[PDB]
Symmetry: none
């Protein structure tokens, strides 16, 4: 009996936007941008169908505008404590340079830049 | 609820991303090929907290452009609003003179003209 | 019991609501039709907490208006008395002092798109 | 077991139904500031179309050097059609078949108030 596991069916993983109202997200960005004008408000979440990489401990981040995607990837890799073999991809609008430029092009209606990470470059 | 601020690697200067010999060679070709254009480095001041980062660092400025015209060009590349202060410092110095005269007085050992911009005049 | 502030997404600036080519064609039409008037964008500072907003953003300033007269015009649209602080900023510089023809300001300060951009606020530095 | 049973969800919403007349204008404003030589076009399959396949995307950029005849030919091989297949591209109720005028002229006369040029494709020319 205790040779076998019982998987507990849990609730669905919920995204940041369903965890926080759009007005709270706009007030979040508005306050953080007036007071930290050189830092980009970034949402980083695990791809919903991801089954190799662990979950990050936080979701809402502020990234200095001089940080590029390659440096950001390395930061998230140590936060997840990945080993050198583990694959990691960070997707903005499904697509795998300084973040401020990504921010100006891809930021959300609510002012956040949304990113999704996975162990594959795929959809 | 609160943001988690990610700090990245140090903002490293142009002289830190390119060796003195590569920079010397950069100038030598561009001045041999564009004798009437000034090779200019424009970087955001190190402790700058309000202005955004520029997308490029290495610029060519026609030799007849004056400092006042260059400031307006940079203000518009940064998409600044009319209220936003902007100062362009050459060797710490913040005008109706042609860039070619500034180039002859202030150019670096490597042949580049170095400029730093900030929202404050002096530091 | 407490007030709750209703905010939407950031309202966009004039340059964010109209392309560079639409603005150039805006200016070319208005300069062909009003040869003695200067096209000026006047917007309230994004973080302004004291001065009211104007209904309009796109303005024509007759060439006989100097900077001192223009300041008084905008102050009186805002219904300020002589007491209240008011600053009108062009390319990062507040223009209280100038009291100069609008055509000179336009020719020295206009944007590449042909508009002269101004921001007003109750503070001079940010 | 002899016959197939059709799987269907609620009616799919068109682009104009999935996007308010603010998200669409604001889309055009960024894309036209950023790609001044490309025309923003919505291309959707006729809602009752039973012959032509669906495209993966709805929002397209057409370079200004593309004329209507070349655009049709682009969509036809994007759909991987045979040489037969009837294919008609309709704008504001009109079949674009023998137009061949530059896309920017089509755009300026036929664009929507929101700034998109709307097109629908089908294997029939009338409805």
């Amino acid at each position: 009996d205790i040779d076998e596991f019982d998987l507990l069916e849990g609730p669905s993983e919920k995204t940041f936007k369903q965890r926080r109202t759009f007005e709270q997200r706009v007030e979040d960005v508005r306050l953080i941008r007036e007071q930290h004008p050189t830092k980009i408000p970034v949402i980083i979440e695990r791809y919903k169908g991801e089954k190799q990489l662990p979950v990050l401990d936080k979701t809402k981040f502020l990234v200095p505008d001089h940080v590029n995607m390659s440096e950001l990837i390395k930061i998230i890799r140590r936060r997840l404590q990945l080993n050198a073999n583990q694959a990691f991809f960070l997707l903005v609008n499904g697509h795998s340079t300084p973040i401020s430029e990504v921010y100006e092009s891809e930021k959300d209606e609510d002012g956040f830049l949304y990113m999704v990470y996975a162990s594959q470059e795929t959809f």
